[PDB]
Swiss-Prot record:
DNA-binding region(s), residue ranges: 27-50, 78-101
Signal peptide boundaries: none
Domain remarks in the Swiss-Prot or TrEMBL record: Comprised of 3 domains; an N-terminal DNA-binding domain, a centrally located transcriptional activation domain and a C-terminal domain involved in transcriptional repression. C-terminal truncated mutants display increased transactivation.
Organism: Mus musculus
Protein name listed in UniProt: Transcriptional activator Myb
Amino acid sequence: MLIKGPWTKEEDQRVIKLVQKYGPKRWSVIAKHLKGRIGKQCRERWHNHLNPEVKKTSWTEEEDRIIYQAHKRLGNRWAEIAKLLPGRTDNAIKNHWNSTMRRKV
DNA sequence: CCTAACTGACA
DNA sequence: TGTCAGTTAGG
């Protein structure tokens, strides 16, 4: 816990190297270095649009079609949508839907 | 509309 | 412990 403040530049661009070293499945070790930032927070920041692996890019016609269809079969099973969309994992497509497309198209 | 952050719930 | 699910939060 602790450091309730937003994820600083000295966390975001620091955890950035730790994932390239360990991988997005060692949040137990990641948190060991960030101390306060528990594995949960680390993953939340990461899985969204922090990932350099997931080059920052906004949704467009060619990506809107992904949630428009996936949400038509899965709906709120972002777990499957995520795996079906190599890149935008969990929060990526989820956060997008219920923010940009919460108005339902 | 786009990404960030914590909180609530689940496997 | 890691992931999923949702809203609130800042941009």
